[PDB]
Design a protein around this motif. Structure first.
Motif, mmCIF file in Angstrom:
data_model
loop_
_atom_site.group_PDB
_atom_site.id
_atom_site.type_symbol
_atom_site.label_atom_id
_atom_site.label_comp_id
_atom_site.label_asym_id
_atom_site.label_seq_id
_atom_site.Cartn_x
_atom_site.Cartn_y
_atom_site.Cartn_z
ATOM 1 N N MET A 1 0.726 -1.247 0.000
ATOM 2 C CA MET A 1 0.000 0.000 0.000
ATOM 3 C C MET A 1 0.769 1.320 0.000
ATOM 4 O O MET A 1 0.243 2.342 -0.467
ATOM 5 N N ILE A 2 2.022 1.361 0.458
ATOM 6 C CA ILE A 2 2.710 2.623 0.504
ATOM 7 C C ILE A 2 3.405 2.772 -0.830
ATOM 8 O O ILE A 2 4.266 1.954 -1.168
ATOM 9 N N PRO A 3 3.110 3.799 -1.632
ATOM 10 C CA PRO A 3 3.681 3.976 -2.966
ATOM 11 C C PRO A 3 5.102 4.569 -2.896
ATOM 12 O O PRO A 3 5.349 5.640 -3.441
ATOM 13 N N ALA A 4 6.049 3.941 -2.212
ATOM 14 C CA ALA A 4 7.408 4.458 -2.119
ATOM 15 C C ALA A 4 8.282 3.270 -1.693
ATOM 16 O O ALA A 4 7.720 2.324 -1.123
ATOM 17 N N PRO A 5 9.598 3.201 -1.939
ATOM 18 C CA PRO A 5 10.422 2.077 -1.519
ATOM 19 C C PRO A 5 10.535 1.907 -0.001
ATOM 20 O O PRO A 5 10.706 2.897 0.735
ATOM 21 N N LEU A 6 10.455 0.684 0.494
ATOM 22 C CA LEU A 6 10.752 0.402 1.888
ATOM 23 C C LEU A 6 12.279 0.522 2.017
ATOM 24 O O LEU A 6 13.008 -0.227 1.358
ATOM 25 N N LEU A 7 12.783 1.420 2.843
ATOM 26 C CA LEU A 7 14.219 1.648 3.039
ATOM 27 C C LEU A 7 14.862 0.689 4.039
ATOM 28 O O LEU A 7 16.088 0.526 4.053
ATOM 29 N N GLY A 8 14.127 0.035 4.942
ATOM 30 C CA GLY A 8 14.705 -0.891 5.891
ATOM 31 C C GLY A 8 13.739 -1.045 7.024
ATOM 32 O O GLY A 8 12.744 -0.312 7.130
ATOM 33 N N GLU A 9 14.047 -2.002 7.871
ATOM 34 C CA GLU A 9 13.221 -2.344 9.028
ATOM 35 C C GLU A 9 14.125 -2.398 10.236
ATOM 36 O O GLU A 9 15.133 -3.104 10.217
ATOM 37 N N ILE A 10 13.779 -1.648 11.278
ATOM 38 C CA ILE A 10 14.582 -1.603 12.468
ATOM 39 C C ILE A 10 13.931 -2.588 13.439
ATOM 40 O O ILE A 10 12.734 -2.533 13.732
ATOM 41 N N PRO A 11 14.712 -3.568 13.912
ATOM 42 C CA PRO A 11 14.244 -4.580 14.854
ATOM 43 C C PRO A 11 13.903 -4.013 16.234
ATOM 44 O O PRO A 11 14.342 -2.927 16.618
ATOM 45 N N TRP A 12 13.143 -4.790 16.989
ATOM 46 C CA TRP A 12 12.726 -4.372 18.302
ATOM 47 C C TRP A 12 13.947 -4.475 19.206
ATOM 48 O O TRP A 12 14.664 -5.482 19.285
ATOM 49 N N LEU A 13 14.204 -3.363 19.844
ATOM 50 C CA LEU A 13 15.280 -3.249 20.804
ATOM 51 C C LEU A 13 14.559 -2.466 21.923
ATOM 52 O O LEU A 13 13.563 -1.747 21.691
ATOM 53 N N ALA A 14 14.978 -2.622 23.182
ATOM 54 C CA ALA A 14 14.374 -1.857 24.276
ATOM 55 C C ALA A 14 14.481 -0.342 24.072
ATOM 56 O O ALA A 14 13.686 0.395 24.673
ATOM 57 N N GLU A 15 15.471 -0.018 23.206
ATOM 58 C CA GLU A 15 15.934 1.268 22.707
ATOM 59 C C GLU A 15 16.954 1.694 23.790
ATOM 60 O O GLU A 15 17.730 0.822 24.222
#
Lengths: 220, 220
Positions: free
Chosen positions: A194-208
């Protein structure tokens, strides 16, 4: 300089996690980088003045040594809409100062990341929203989306409105804001469709913290 | 019948609290009312089948005695997007069945409230969203907004997209989802200025029943 505006789909999407990842990847590519958050509310008092943690994070993640006020000209202590606290404090948020601050960064940095102060339509005065400034500056937009059920609707809304403003949606970043859940893959699929733009990456779950590696800068 | 579609700005806005308030006010005005939630996911098992609590609430708040399946033709147990669980269960969500169910209610009720299954852009299949059906049925839309900082942006996004679809934004309902907070009045002002439709009423914070009184039906 290359310039990008970063906006999130909702408040809890980890927008500055994605902004630090983006700045880290730009630095690794050999760009002189600068973070810029013109307007920030929700700030801590210090001996030097009010410092907002998101702008601090942009500052420490810039390859250039920058003073705080260069990264964040307008700092407000209360975490509410900028138009409310600007009007309460008697300090107008000026479009020309926001634009001058970006120019000052462009004479030093060749890759600048601009972060807003809330969602797309954050009011800065009664007649001027953050969207009006971004449209005026003609900034390409990067969307940060939390991989959660409500954000399918939020990402689609935001994407439609940016495109309607005639701006370029440069790409999006998926941020994993919860531990792995049951429909993670199907949510990622729906969002990529649905998003008309490239997915640049996915940041994994970290507690931050070194998160530049999750971003493919070649898609921008 | 008069017909209205109800949509929320975000997941936590108490959309069915506002739907029960709307149905109660319509009943007090002397309308034969019916609630209709064609698609619902997130359901409890019973001896009669799956019942979703939001559709149960629409059913009990209708002035007419209605069977459950009349209020909610499509009921899915897992709380995820309808297109995901429909595809997992092998049960297509059919636009004609959704439309037939609304017609069946129109031959009995003269004021029908239709509730969606998530935000504006909730996917029902890979090629069909809830927004496509609402546009097809030409339903007037009522927006339910939680009085909170993030919803200024969410309400504005949703409002813009509905208007872009050429639909009528019939009005909005403010729902007080938290105890009284510091910027409640300024938030109500900003939302009233920015949403191009009449504010129909404000439902006070209750832990979460007779709420019809908070709605001025004369504005619809």
């Amino acid at each position: 300089s290359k310039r990008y505006f970063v906006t999130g789909t909702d408040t809890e999407v980890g927008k500055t996690v994605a902004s630090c990842a983006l700045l880290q990847a730009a630095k690794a590519a050999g760009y002189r980088t600068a973070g810029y958050k013109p307007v920030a509310s929700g700030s801590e008092k210090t001996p030097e003045g009010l410092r907002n943690s998101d702008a601090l994070a942009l500052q420490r993640n810039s390859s250039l040594q920058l003073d705080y006020a260069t990264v964040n000209p307008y700092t407000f202590a209360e975490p509410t809409s900028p138009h409310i606290i600007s009007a309460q404090e008697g300090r107008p948020i000026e479009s020309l100062v926001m634009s001058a601050g970006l120019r000052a960064l462009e004479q030093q940095a060749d890759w600048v990341l601009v972060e807003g102060a809330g969602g797309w339509f954050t009011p800065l005065s009664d007649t001027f929203t953050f969207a009006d400034w971004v449209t005026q500056e003609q900034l390409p937009v990067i969307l940060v989306v939390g991989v959660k059920l409500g954000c399918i609707n939020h990402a689609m809304l935001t994407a439609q409105v940016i495109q309607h403003a005639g701006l370029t949606l440069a790409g999006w970043v998926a941020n994993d804001v919860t531990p792995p859940g049951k429909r993670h893959a199907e949510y990622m699929t729906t969002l990529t469709r649905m998003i008309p733009a490239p997915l640049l990456g996915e940041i994994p779950w970290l507690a931050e913290a070194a998160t530049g590696k999750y971003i493919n800068l070649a898609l921008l």
